[PDB]
Amino acid sequence: ADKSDLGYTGLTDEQAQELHSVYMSGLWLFSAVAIVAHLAVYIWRPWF
Amino acid sequence: ADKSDLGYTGLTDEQAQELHSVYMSGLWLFSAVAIVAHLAVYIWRPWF
Amino acid sequence: ADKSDLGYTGLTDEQAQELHSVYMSGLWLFSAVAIVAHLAVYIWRPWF
Amino acid sequence: AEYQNIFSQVQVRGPADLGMTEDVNLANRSGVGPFSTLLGWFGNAQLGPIYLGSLGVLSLFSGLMWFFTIGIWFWYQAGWNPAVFLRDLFFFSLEPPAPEYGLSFAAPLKEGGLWLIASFFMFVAVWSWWGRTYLRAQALGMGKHTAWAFLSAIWLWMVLGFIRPILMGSWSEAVPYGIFSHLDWTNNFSLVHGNLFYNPFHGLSIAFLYGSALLFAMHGATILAVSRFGGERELEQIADRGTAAERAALFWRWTMGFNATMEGIHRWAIWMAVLVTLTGGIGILLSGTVVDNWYVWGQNHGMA
Amino acid sequence: DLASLAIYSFWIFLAGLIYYLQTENMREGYPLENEDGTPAANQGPFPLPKPKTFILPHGRGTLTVPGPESEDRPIALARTAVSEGFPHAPTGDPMKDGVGPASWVARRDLPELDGHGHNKIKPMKAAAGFHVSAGKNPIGLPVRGCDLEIAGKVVDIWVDIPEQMARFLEVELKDGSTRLLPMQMVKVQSNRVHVNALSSDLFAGIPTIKSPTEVTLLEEDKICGYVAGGLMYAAPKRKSVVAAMLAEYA
Amino acid sequence: ALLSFERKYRVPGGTLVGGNLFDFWVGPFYVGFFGVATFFFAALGIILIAWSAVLQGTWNPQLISVYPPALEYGLGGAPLAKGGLWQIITICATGAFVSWALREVEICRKLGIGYHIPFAFAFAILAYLTLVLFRPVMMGAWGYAFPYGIWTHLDWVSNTGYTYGNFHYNPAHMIAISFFFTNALALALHGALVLSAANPEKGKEMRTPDHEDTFFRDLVGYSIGTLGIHRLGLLLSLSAVFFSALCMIITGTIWFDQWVDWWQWWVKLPWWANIPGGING
Amino acid sequence: WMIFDPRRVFVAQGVFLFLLAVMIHLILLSTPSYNWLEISAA
Amino acid sequence: WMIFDPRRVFVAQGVFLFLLAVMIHLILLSTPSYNWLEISAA
Amino acid sequence: WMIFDPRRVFVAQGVFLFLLAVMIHLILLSTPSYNWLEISAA
Amino acid sequence: WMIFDPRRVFVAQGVFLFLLAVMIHLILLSTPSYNWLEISAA
Amino acid sequence: WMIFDPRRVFVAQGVFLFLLAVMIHLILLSTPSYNWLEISAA
Amino acid sequence: WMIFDPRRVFVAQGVFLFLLAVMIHLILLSTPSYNWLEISAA
Amino acid sequence: WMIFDPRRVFVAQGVFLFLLAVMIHLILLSTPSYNWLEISAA
Amino acid sequence: WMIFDPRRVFVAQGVFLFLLAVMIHLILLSTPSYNWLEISAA
Amino acid sequence: WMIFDPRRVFVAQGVFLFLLAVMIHLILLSTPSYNWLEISAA
Amino acid sequence: WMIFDPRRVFVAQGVFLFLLAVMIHLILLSTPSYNWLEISAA
Ligand code: BCL
Ligand code: BCL
Ligand code: BCL
Ligand SMILES: CC[C@H]1c2cc3[nH]c4c(c3C)C(=O)[C@H](C(=O)OC)c4c3nc(cc4[nH]c(cc(n2)[C@@H]1C)c(C(C)=O)c4C)[C@@H](C)[C@@H]3CCC(=O)OC/C=C(\C)CCC[C@H](C)CCC[C@H](C)CCCC(C)C
Ligand SMILES: CC[C@H]1c2cc3[nH]c4c(c3C)C(=O)[C@H](C(=O)OC)c4c3nc(cc4[nH]c(cc(n2)[C@@H]1C)c(C(C)=O)c4C)[C@@H](C)[C@@H]3CCC(=O)OC/C=C(\C)CCC[C@H](C)CCC[C@H](C)CCCC(C)C
Ligand SMILES: COC(C)(C)C/C=C/C(C)=C/C=C/C(C)=C/C=C/C(C)=C\C=C\C=C(C)\C=C\C=C(/C)CC/C=C(\C)CCC=C(C)C
């Protein structure tokens, strides 16, 4: 049966194990992977 | 748990620890941080 | 259950909570900018 | 002989019943028409009755001498044999008074004769059958919309050989009579006027015939599709909203991005109707007294 | 007239015809309501119009439409996502609470009327119009459900006159307590019937028509909706049903 | 957003094998398993109006052109804007025609409204195919095709449509027009067969399907009912296309010659063979 | 009813002022005198 | 009050400013004066 | 909270970026004057 | 299983590499100035 | 009997020899052959 | 009975002064021999 | 029984020969040579 | 009988005359010589 | 008692005054012999 | 009764001085003779 409070579902403790391990890790496993890959993209080839 | 009437849902604190905690991620990473992209812009290149 | 007769809402005293939170102040500063971001542009570039 | 009851439709026939009575008539409609009970398990099976008054048979006659006038100009060249008639039931031809005659009916039988009669009678056949759909919706208590998509339909009939070939003044400016003669005529108004592609009044009328099948490919689908429930009865699905405005009114909004009222699905369907030969009548009343060569129209009001 | 004039009495007089037309199709259904009974997000760029007077065909009242829109009938979906978007699931079994694929509504107790002073849909033992009196005639044969097993025996036809048509196929149970079932889904070939919707041990769950001759417009909602209830779920998950529900052609 | 009665209808599933992984209702629109597919198809497709806007010429969809390949390059590719880049637009177009007519089934199996709708777009699937696949695979190369534009494929159908003399002599074409003018022939009275009963002239009691049987039997002598003209809209609107895809599946690939020269196969009969009669005589 | 609030400003109003802005620009960006973008050199 | 997020802010609202942003990155590349990276060869 | 984690957090990023990256490539390929293989053909 | 292994990547990735394979076959096998197997006649 | 007596004689008087005479006059007046009333002027 | 008594002689007779009459009017009008309104000065 | 005595020989026989005589007359009549009503003057 | 009276008495009087009149009032004005309203002039 | 009265008086009153004038206007509006508004100086 | 009143005699009294007024203003402006709002240089 469905419950009540904040917030469901779910699922404490899963504010820092579910919505931060596969949610805030995206702000890294590609957001910074852009910054390194752009060192081989930004200069090819806007300068002829 | 089901609801009935205005203006759920809603509601709280499914609105307080949720809706307050995700909308500013779309209203800051694009509101004032979008003026951090204005850096390499406001001078490059409106003035020739 | 939903609501009763005309109008609800309405309603007195429920006409000024959500028709006046992003519908009155989200238009007056939009009009102020129609005065502010317009009066500084009432001079360039008509005159060469 | 018994009427059977086969497997999966199904059907039951009807004894002796007609419709309704108010402003119609009693002793005019003929005997109970004989029923075509021949695998009539799909749709209906019932001939008759029919309002055979002088508001309908004025088109049976005025259509018949529209039917016989080009008729006695479809046997005229054959050779007086029944061999060449059905041989050239189409290859035969007949044109109105010449591109130089016009306002005078002094023309004899030959060069351009049997054009002046067919239409003259047809004139009170079409116009006497605009009002076999406009007043038989008054014999009960309905509306007039049925011939207001028809006043729009005889808006394209209001220009072809009527309003333009008299102001300008000639009968060649009306349509030749036959079964191919006017097909060597639908491409005439094309090329003489410099092609009517840059004529987006003839082309939007097109554009209003490409919304008759964007509007009835699906109506004939979904009303047959929500019929297991109860959407076939279009006379109890609007003011008392049944579940047919639930399997057909959640179905399209999710899909293309909007649905419609059981009544409003007959408000667009007659808006891609009173706008086909209506935007055709204008886009053919704008062709001949505005800009002929429409290639010399759609590059000065189009690209320029 | 001119070469540049008439295309403007059109970019204007008709540029609001998707606008005027849409609202006239947005009478019923609207306003938009949330997932509980709440003044919802909004309506749209073509908001619903305030309705005009509606006169009814057999004096059924001042039923203006859009009309009744609130929460009269019972609904039973346990809100999985309290957020508006993600779907909801019934309580026990979905074919008892009446939620999901099987839909109905609560109406007034006056059945559909024609104009003769009588009701619309009646059996063949309510209209001695067309009968059986030549050769051997098939009105009485056994059936089969979606479970691929015999379901009952249909021996009658609900007649029609204005459409000269049919709407139901009445089943004589072992007992007699009434049941009903739609008309277009059916797929009969030879000497036995096959329905591919409901199993042959879920036919009593179809309401007994309060009268075996009358169908009130109140009743004509679940009676042609329970079969739609079995066109969504049926049937998890393995074996025979996979060679029954899927594939096929017609 | 959702309607007022859109309460009970909300249930997950509809999709086939895999789960309810893609079926999230983004707004008033349905994003099932073929929902995000069309999201993938509609996003790339707006760029296909803009690609040959720097290769062919103009940037406005007035004259934007990604031409079909040439006639003789074979069973293969093309240049680019003149075929190659044209060769990519189709499988999106058609890959988007498909992901739409079949995302309806994720609603059809979701509820229980009939499967005669994954079908009335499949006469549009079998009407756009006859100009992109059905033709130019056999006569040489993919060069036998039309341009995608809105004013380019215009001067492609007329001043470039008399290859077969006149196309009115094309009998099925003209029968697939003996089928087309009849679509709004039966939408014009059926879109007005439910309008004027609650709004008769103003005030009067509403009509039932017995006044329908004293208005249309008081019209044109044939009253197949109200379910005989939804079997009289889906009879006006799907078939003017298979009588046109048959007016062209034996036109050009077998008859790239004058179809005005087809109407001399009719006057040739042993009875009236050596005989010039009328007009012809 | 009639006029609600909390959905228009998120996905509709942001493209209403923008829609009110777009059919204005491509004429004043392309008037015989104005433009104010491309011309900055001469 | 009202309104929805947990569904919208993951696959819905992201294509609103995406409907505002990438629709105009193209344009600043069509102009033969702005461009900001196009005119490189010459 | 809510949304998804075992369902729609590894797939709202797979074909979503494929709906924003690999079809964004077709803009930097709509070039044939730049282009990482059409430089020679100029 | 976070991602779906015998679903999203067993017959849906075999056409996901089929996604980027043949659409480019009509760009690189195309190009108005390459070929290098077709023009064995001119 | 078999055809109506007091009906198809008052109203059929102008549908029987009226579908008939209207197309027998047009031949005895096939122009350049007869005249007799068009001789007046000439 | 059947034969429209207070009808065919009121309305159908009021139009047969147009059905029988005017179809032969628009022929002998422009006939040069009779003329009687088209003689003119010569 | 079997053969119509009332119907066919009175109302369907008046159209039996009508089918056989009306289309058969419109062949032998007004040939440019025979005529027997046109050349009774030429 | 077969028909009533006192309703079509305003439409056989109001507009019925002009159905005949509109097709007859304009077979005369076409002549540049008559006109009676155009010639009473120069 | 056969047709209508109330409808003809408020809406079908037009096909007597307007759609009989507005079409006959542009006829005598285009005629030089009258002009009124095209008088000015000629 | 008759026709709509709280519907038809108000909101349709617009096209009386709109659709009628617009397509009669359009002609009397574009005429070589009128203009009236064009005369200034003298
Ligand atoms: C060069 C080729 C041009 C072109 C050349 C032309 C020409 C020339 C014309 C059209 C016109 C039209 N074109 Mg175009 N057209 C092109 C492309 C197309 C294409 C397409 C390829 O997609 C189509 C489908 C069409 C078809 C159309 C129509 C949309 C439009 C006229 C409608 C019509 O036929 O009403 C016809 C309906 C009526 C006239 C009303 C009929 C009702 C009557 C009054 C009732 C009679 C009563 C009688 C008694 C009933 C007896 C029945 C008995 C009981 C049996 N064109 C290209 C671009 N086209 C026509 C037009 O008007 O342009 C806007 C026209 O002249
Ligand atoms: C079949 C013979 C000719 C042809 C004959 C005609 C004739 C005649 C007409 C058209 C017209 C049109 N044709 Mg064409 N057309 C052909 C090929 C096609 C094909 C195809 C790929 O097979 C399609 C899908 C279409 C359909 C179209 C539309 C683009 C356009 C208006 C349709 C309409 O109003 O009716 C209903 C259809 C709709 C309401 C759908 C709307 C179609 C719109 C215009 C196309 C959308 C493109 C859009 C601008 C791009 C947006 C993408 C991003 C948002 C930027 N044609 C072939 C080559 N076509 C009409 C026109 O002139 O256009 C104004 C017209 O009169
Ligand atoms: C020379 C002039 C010739 C002629 C030139 C041609 C040419 C060329 C063609 C035809 C074709 C046809 N002609 Mg022709 N034709 C003539 C004039 C006419 C007239 C007329 C009354 O004037 C009519 C009624 C017709 C009718 C016909 C049909 C027999 C046939 C149409 C097939 C078709 O379109 O289905 C096809 C159906 C579709 C394409 C719809 C498919 C829908 C798809 C799946 C969805 C598209 C979505 C879209 C991209 C998105 C837009 C919407 C946006 C989101 C807004 N022609 C004259 C006689 N005609 C076509 C044909 O016979 O081949 C089949 C054809 O190529
Ligand atoms: C005989 C079949 C008739 C028919 C039926 C029909 N059309 C239908 C349907 C049905 C049942 C729908 O259910 C569906 C609909 O939504 O209802 C309107 C539809 C539809 N008919 C449409 C258009 C249409 N149908 C047409 C014709 C016909 N439709 C036939 C007459 C035509 C014409 C005039 O030929 C057009 C223009 C769409 C509005 C809609 C299809 C909705 C759909 O499937 O969307 C998928 C598309 C995308 C996701 C976009 C991706 C595509 C690429 C990104 C670009 C495509 C390139 C291409 C060249 C586009 C160019 C368009 C024009 C410039 C040619
Ligand atoms: C909005 C535009 C669309 C449209 C609308 C439209 N068409 C309409 C209407 C409307 C509103 C009608 O109200 C009217 C109608 O009643 O529909 C059934 C009609 C109609 N449109 C029709 C056809 C039609 N539709 C067309 C198309 C379109 N019409 C578009 C799709 C076209 C085209 C493309 O030009 C045509 C030709 C007819 C079915 C019908 C017209 C009814 C009519 O006027 O006929 C009068 C009756 C006769 C002439 C009877 C005479 C019969 C023959 C002429 C004599 C020979 C036979 C006779 C039996 C001899 C045998 C002797 C016997 C006595 C034994
Ligand atoms: C065995 O054969 C028998 C003996 C039965 C006779 C057969 C005859 C035949 C072959 C009949 C064939 C009929 C057919 C098929 C006709 C086809 C017609 C077609 C395809 C199109 C016709 C369209 C109608 C047109 C072009 C009419 C145009 C006329 C107008 C728009 C207005 C005309 C108005 C005029 C002339 C003014 C008259 C009015 C006044 C007030 C003077």
Ligand SMILES: [Fe+2]
């Ligand atoms: Fe309908």
